[PDB]
């Protein structure tokens, strides 16, 4: 609940977060590290705001980037299920699977 709140606070509205793709969610925190590196032809950050997620903290080294891609791409899928729902059971079963 704390990492996901910082994504909503960064993006703004809930619907604008679902309209963001998987890469935008993954690099949602480090706009400073991304746009500096894009305009100088360097390497982009791989974590952003998602470093404080629990599953990213379980990985080590190179594995932290690999998890943060899969976690944010699943979070993009999870957020698109959330922001448009009419038959929501409020149990988060799609998030759990």
């Amino acid at each position: 609940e704390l990492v996901g709140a910082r994504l909503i606070a960064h993006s703004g509205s809930l619907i604008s977060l679902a309209k963001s793709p998987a890469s935008t969610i993954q690099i949602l925190g480090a706009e400073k590290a991304l746009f500096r590196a894009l305009k100088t032809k360097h390497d982009t950050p791989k974590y952003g705001l998602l470093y404080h997620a629990s599953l990213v903290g379980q990985a080590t080294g190179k594995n932290k980037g690999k998890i943060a891609r899969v976690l944010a791409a699943k979070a993009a899928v999870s957020l698109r299920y959330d922001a448009l729902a009419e038959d929501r059971d409020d149990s988060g079963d799609i998030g759990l699977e």
């Binding site: 619907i15 309209k19 793709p21 890469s23 899928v77 698109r80």
Partner: protein, 121 residues
């Protein structure tokens, strides 16, 4: 009432999956739901091809909301796996996005299928 706006019939899905077969033969088509959002924000999309039997169908319903602001076309095909094979990739694709290229040899096909899905909307 339905899941979304228009679902292409048996006949329209021939020509709409003939172009994305020729586009992948040309390697111009961009594939995936998140990559279809990328070319929408860039504004270099031709039209977006979503699938009508996603599990769940919600996870690509964001694309019609990003559609009717820059008026890019969008259809539904009734199978992810059938869209996945016309894309030319072994995994199922729920959302395919043709990119624009004025110097392309699929030009007469790609503007044919543009205007008949304007009528579909």
């Amino acid at each position: 009432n339905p899941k979304a706006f228009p679902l292409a019939d048996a006949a329209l899905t021939q020509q709409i999956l003939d172009v994305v077969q020729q586009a992948a033969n040309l390697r111009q088509l961009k594939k995936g739901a998140n990559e279809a959002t990328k070319t929408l924000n860039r504004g270099i999309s031709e039209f977006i091809i979503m699938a009508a039997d996603c599990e769940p169908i919600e996870i690509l319903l964001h694309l019609p909301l990003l559609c009717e602001d820059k008026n890019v076309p969008y259809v539904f095909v009734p199978s992810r796996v059938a869209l996945g094979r016309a894309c030319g990739v072994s995994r199922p694709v729920i959302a395919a996005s043709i990119t624009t290229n004025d110097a392309s040899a699929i030009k007469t096909q790609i503007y044919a299928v543009k205007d008949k899905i304007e009528t579909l909307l």
